[PDB]
């Protein structure tokens, strides 16, 4: 169990989980706010 | 009398061709035998380009820094 959690903290797995969460967030941001060449809220 | 610095003290490496030049290391043993041109034994935190972590230096090649 502790060894399994230590494996999940290795560089590639932490990178995938972190970049997957990051990719999903940016996808939803461009899904609710598509296009946008500017910062429109001024 | 103990020539050179005490063992364990931090030393600023002054040998210009050293991988740890201008850096700092820790003393291991000071060879009190004269005619030994490089008595100061220093151990380093990071390995050099030959994966070596210890080297011998002269007395005028090391400076004691705290």
């Amino acid at each position: 169990m502790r060894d399994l959690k230590t494996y999940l903290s290795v560089a590639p797995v932490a990178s995938t989980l972190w970049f997957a969460a990051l990719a999903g967030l940016l996808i939803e941001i461009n899904r609710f706010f598509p296009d946008a060449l500017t910062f429109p809220f001024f | 009398p103990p020539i050179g610095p005490k063992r364990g003290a931090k030393v600023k490496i002054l040998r210009q061709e050293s991988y740890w030049y201008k850096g700092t290391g820790s003393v291991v043993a000071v060879d009190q035998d004269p005619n030994t041109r490089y008595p100061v034994v220093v151990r380093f935190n990071k390995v050099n380009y030959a994966n070596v972590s210890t080297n011998n230096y002269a007395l005028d090649e090391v400076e004691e820094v705290k």
Binding site: - | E17, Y19, D31, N35, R37, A50, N55, N56
Partner: protein, 80 residues
């Protein structure tokens, strides 16, 4: 032939002589280091320049230095 030099930073571990593939290095008695021995290059006419000795030196910086010089049949490794 290639020039080879030994500097007094040598600790006398006899590693350059073991790695040499053409028997150029020797171990002579000396009084400078703890092992009572230093290296010398008396047969650089057979030296090929592989720098296999420099790859094995633990001194920082190196105590064996191979300065590639005038090429000869022996230094070029020619069997023809």
């Amino acid at each position: 032939s290639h020039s080879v030099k030994i500097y007094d930073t040598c600790i006398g571990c006899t590693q350059c002589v073991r790695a040499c593939p053409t028997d150029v290095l020797e171990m002579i008695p000396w009084g400078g280091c703890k092992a009572k021995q230093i290296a010398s290059a008396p047969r650089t006419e057979d030296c090929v320049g592989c720098k296999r000795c420099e790859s094995a030196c633990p001194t920082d910086f190196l105590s064996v230095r191979v300065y590639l010089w005038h090429e000869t049949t022996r230094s070029m490794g020619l069997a023809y």
